[PDB]
Amino acid sequence: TTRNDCLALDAQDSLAPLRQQFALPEGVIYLDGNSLGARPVAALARAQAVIAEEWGNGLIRSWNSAGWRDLSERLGNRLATLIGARDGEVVVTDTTSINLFKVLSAALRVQATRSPERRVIVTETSNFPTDLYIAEGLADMLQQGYTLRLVDSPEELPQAIDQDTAVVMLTHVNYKTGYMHDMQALTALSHECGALAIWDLAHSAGAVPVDLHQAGADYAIGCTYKYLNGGPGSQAFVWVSPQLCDLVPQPLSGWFGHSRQFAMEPRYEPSNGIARYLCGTQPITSLAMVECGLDVFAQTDMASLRRKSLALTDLFIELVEQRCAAHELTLVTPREHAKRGSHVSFEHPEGYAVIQALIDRGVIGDYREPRIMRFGFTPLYTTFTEVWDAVQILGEILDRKTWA
Amino acid sequence: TTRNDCLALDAQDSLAPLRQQFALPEGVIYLDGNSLGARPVAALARAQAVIAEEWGNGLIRSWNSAGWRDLSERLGNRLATLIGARDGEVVVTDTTSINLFKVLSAALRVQATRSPERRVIVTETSNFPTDLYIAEGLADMLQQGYTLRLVDSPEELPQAIDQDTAVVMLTHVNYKTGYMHDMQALTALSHECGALAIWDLAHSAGAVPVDLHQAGADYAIGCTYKYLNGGPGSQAFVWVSPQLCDLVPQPLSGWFGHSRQFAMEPRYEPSNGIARYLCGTQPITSLAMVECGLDVFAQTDMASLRRKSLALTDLFIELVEQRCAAHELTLVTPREHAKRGSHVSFEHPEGYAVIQALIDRGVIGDYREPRIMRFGFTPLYTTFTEVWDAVQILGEILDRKTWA
Ligand SMILES: *Cc1c(COP(=O)(O)O)cnc(C)c1O
Ligand SMILES: *Cc1c(COP(=O)(O)O)cnc(C)c1O
Ligand SMILES: [Cl-]
Ligand SMILES: [Cl-]
């Protein structure tokens, strides 16, 4: 592959116009949109309106006159289009850690009636730390004998899922390796074994095709600030299968989840449907900007984005081997597309130092322990040519030992 | 009292210059800053910088290069100055409902070791609904025999607090009546009885003098979007007495509360101190604007604000009686200052209709069930003359039966 081949790929790229809907800083090749999505141009004006007009002038009236009262649900309805969910099934609220607590609590309470004695939550050792920590906090508070089974690889999951399994809790795309689980198959296997399946979509929603209904998933959660480009710390989302949602309340039972059809008397009464997963007053300025990120996706579809994403990661892996073969890089992301998300990770003995030398030259990925260099490929605003230019900078750094 | 007396009060008002630090809409007399605080002028430019510069240009780098990593703690440190807390004791994160869940869980777990068999959480029937609902959700998830004792008036609290009381959970200023508890005395009595004391400061922080250390309080939570003027749905805060903080973990154990001195391995390890009450990634744009509200308070103190607040509520009550005596208004807020917060509530048979007729004329309070008309007085940006003008509009409405 040559630079000219990459320039041609960009010329043929039907998604090219969508890049213009983002305000990217000059000179930067941003390969960390899997950790903080780049900014849609419209986010600035949207926030200016929330602040100056809705808050500043409307004040408390804006709960009605600016639509704030149903923002979590309208945003959920938009996001649903990207994950095989329907209207009235998704809300955007709180954070991924919090939402996981809500659905894991709901799942264990469903299984306490259905199948008591089931006490194990199966997951992976390399799961995103907060998912582990939240599951550990919940189990520690409940007692007992709720315990966590950490499995050291994806292939060991089937033997760890058995009659003792209350819940299988997995992040669909591994935050370190970029390995992608087969959602439908691991869900079917969880159900076969009697367990409910909870999927963290942080590295999936807006990155790869997801269809929660088709997969038979029970609960899901994820972030809007990564591939969905919602802004820094923008609120997470939660989806619950209509089969399960109204069976039990979730424990973070704040007033926004109270039924809207009856007055707020001393006794909590949950809303029918997903609105029961609402809790408290949401940071509105940050919440409103989620819309700007979602709006860009409306101009294409996840099949088209998946296609460009695979072309970008294929190109990155190929170019790194082509240009940097004579250095000590080890691919940790699967070569096989069905097991691949939208990022690529290489290990390197001085991976931290190389990542910082790259950042020092405007090529921004990130470092994960141990020794992993992670690069996210975001087809909405990443070009093929900038992949070439990024690898050339990496090659220059490695050849010159700039990292030292 | 006359309008000219009010004009003179404004001329003598040493706090008058602080009003100019808020961008208020023309023609509005805003008496709902106890529900959504008015906008500091600086909030717009602050958000513009977060969006355009920190997010848009800095991207993921801003976790370091814009201070995002310690924002919750720096904001907590600022807020601490207003509630008798010290550095390293307060964080601004999540919402009041969520934070209450964190501290109530911590309190019950402390009491499960200290004094098992204690199973009652005492509170009031007229407590803000979400506080009740969160306590109900937690008790319902734990089991058992955790139960809630709802007390129908402030004077009935002493007899409800006994040897069975794990926790006394109270909102310091009643959201409906504006009645203010004696924090120090009810805390002392809770401790005398063996209970821990949790105080919701939603209608207290930034409104009345608070000193959590002097009061001997165990845990506290509150909002930044009311009297602290942080913006719509701006994040809540939580304080924990240093005596208790490190005794147990709180159950919403997300990664931001992990110790910063050690790597993020599979096992959660809480930070020493208040940082353990952090959980997940916070909505940064909304969080940053909390600073603008806190900054105004730095230019005065809570004694001075308390003084002007009492002068405003005294004036409102007096003017309403002076001008509206011949109508069916019933004062529900205590006349006695030591039992009074910073708002005034009147009951009226058609209270809802009167509140909307007032809103229709730009005088904005709110309606609480049943039949309560609530008006918040915010000395940072409320003038004495606008109190006069508001009452004159109320008088015109009542005389003409405009509410019909
Ligand atoms: C305003 C208020 C709340 C708000 O709760 P959120 O979870 O922030 O919506 C809670 N409790 C009390 C007493 C309040 O006054
Ligand atoms: C990004 C990410 C999170 C973030 O959690 P917050 O509570 O939003 O900070 C959680 N889990 C996974 C798998 C992630 O990729
Ligand atoms: Cl990540
Ligand atoms: Cl309120």
UniProtKB/Swiss-Prot annotation, chains A, B:
Gene Ontology cellular-component annotations: cytoplasm
InterPro entries: DegT/StrS_aminotransferase (IPR000653), Kynureninase (IPR010111), PyrdxlP-dep_Trfase (IPR015424), PyrdxlP-dep_Trfase_major (IPR015421), PyrdxlP-dep_Trfase_small (IPR015422)
Record-listed E.C. numbers: 3.7.1.3
Pfam families named among the record's database cross-references: DegT_DnrJ_EryC1 (PF01041), KYNU_C (PF22580)
Catalytic reactions on record: L-kynurenine + H2O = anthranilate + L-alanine + H(+); 3-hydroxy-L-kynurenine + H2O = 3-hydroxyanthranilate + L-alanine + H(+)
First-level EC class: hydrolase
N6-(pyridoxal phosphate)lysine found at: 226
UniProt entry keywords in alphabetical sequence: Hydrolase, Pyridine nucleotide biosynthesis, Pyridoxal phosphate
Single GO MF annotation: kynureninase activity
Residues where pyridoxal 5'-phosphate binds: 96-97, 128-131, 171, 200, 203, 225, 255, 281
Keyword Hydrolase: yes
GO terms, biological process: anthranilate metabolic process; L-kynurenine catabolic process; L-tryptophan catabolic process to kynurenine; NAD biosynthetic process; quinolinate biosynthetic process
Cofactor(s) this protein requires: pyridoxal 5'-phosphate
Keyword Hydrolase attached: yes
Domain of life: Bacteria
Pathway annotation: Amino-acid degradation; L-kynurenine degradation; L-alanine and anthranilate from L-kynurenine: step 1/1; Cofactor biosynthesis; NAD(+) biosynthesis; quinolinate from L-kynurenine: step 2/3
SUPFAM superfamilies, per database record: PLP-dependent transferases (SSF53383)
Subunit comment: Homodimer.
Role summary: Catalyzes the cleavage of L-kynurenine (L-Kyn) and L-3-hydroxykynurenine (L-3OHKyn) into anthranilic acid (AA) and 3-hydroxyanthranilic acid (3-OHAA), respectively.
HAMAP family given in the database record: Kynureninase
Family: Belongs to the kynureninase family.
Protein name per the record: Kynureninase
Organism expressing this protein natively: Pseudomonas fluorescens
Lineage: Bacteria, Pseudomonadati, Pseudomonadota, Gammaproteobacteria, Pseudomonadales
